[PDB]
Amino acid sequence: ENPADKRRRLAKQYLENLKSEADIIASRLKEDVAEQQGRVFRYFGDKLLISEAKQSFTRVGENNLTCISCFQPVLNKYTFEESSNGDKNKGRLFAYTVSKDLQLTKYDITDFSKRPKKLKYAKGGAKYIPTSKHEYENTTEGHYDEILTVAASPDGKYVVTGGRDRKLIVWSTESLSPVKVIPTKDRRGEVLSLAFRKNSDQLYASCADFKIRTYSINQFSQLEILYGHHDIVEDISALAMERCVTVGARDRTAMLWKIPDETRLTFRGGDEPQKLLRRWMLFFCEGSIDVVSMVDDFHFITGSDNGNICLWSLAKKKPIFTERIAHGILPEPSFNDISGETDEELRKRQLQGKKLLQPFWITSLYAIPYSNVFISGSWSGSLKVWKISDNLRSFELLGELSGAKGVVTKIQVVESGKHGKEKFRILASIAKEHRLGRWIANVSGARNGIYSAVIDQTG
Amino acid sequence: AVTIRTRKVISNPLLARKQFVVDVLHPNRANVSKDELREKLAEVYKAEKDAVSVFGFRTQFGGGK
């Protein structure tokens, strides 16, 4: 019973399972290894049924729910063992959420029919303020400032959080107990985004000090700092390989980092309404790029503050396709309050027609790995699902989900069921204020809660 | 933590070997001994330590690499 024979047995059992499920077997085996080849291999936009999605909203006590991260076990083909940390956690789905109230909470989302169920939580406060005042000594167990982000390790053994307290605290998934605190060690190094390399313990951290920090959670140590962004790196995404992508906010530049090659590729939008209007014969100039999600190892999408969703390719520096004002234009300000004049017509002139109108921001944008569908978010009050073309040159609006009401700080997707028939659950964090700050005016009907939508595959 | 990175790898069957450039990232550390680096390269390449050679290592100005 040598170890090799054990691999044989698992594979032989594995092959029997595929035979029981079902030419077909050969294709599935290729699909199992489609991931290493960094190309889209999940064409399921058409078979989605958005109209029949079961939508639900669950209120949460915490103020301004800032981010959500979902962990999904995946069977490892190489060893035929599930990613679950322990036998008790076999086939259990967990979702971790953070808020501005210095509280980390975990939920169980295994039952798609049922709402998220809270399991454990940890809350920080003034008790954790460091007395030393030195950056290297910011090693307190809990948070003392707003927590902005959270990420779950692919092994299911740790969950890591960060925020304006310029610390990177990694917690045990089971008990939410802190095990290591890693200071960023810069005065303005506020953590803004975390992305785990898929099926790896590598972590990429974007900090407000214009740098990206890489960590090895298993070793609980920093590895490298990346330089080249000109403004705060608000978002970060990562896939199986080490090619993470970023966006520079007011820099209006999206950068891809070939960590092995120690080289970086620069992408810039470069759209001007004057040319756009002429070619047509409301167009808003891009102000900042806030979100990014990598659809494919050779493609990625970005969302700007002018409501533009742009598709990118590694070959081309310019966008290959753009979708302008994706979430529409903000409501025009009321005439009765724009000015204090008694006569209404005076107040209307202050509106200046439609010049003051501005578009919704793309606060959230998530693409399922190696798929042809991605989801965008804003405070318009609905989540829009888009399908990318087969040639990966354009995308269209697949559908919409209107259940969510408020700022969609972050979006996540989880899948369950057999390979052929999969049920997708969309989990999106909803907050009354934007995650980074309180600029946004209060939206009518907005509530702090976790939005849940469950979508099925039929054809 | 210390990161070891291999680039410009060229297979040379004439000499029956692998030639490459070593980049060592060693934050908060002076530098890494040739012996330890030989251990790690041997483990990475699944070859005997005796078959791994390293030389010409220069620390970049300002340290850390």
Partner: peptide
């Protein structure tokens, strides 16, 4: 006649 068509990758380890 056409010329012959053109034809080891970096590997990483972290320790300590």
């Amino acid at each position: 006649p056409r010329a012959a068509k053109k034809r080891a990758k970096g590997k990483n380890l972290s320790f300590k």
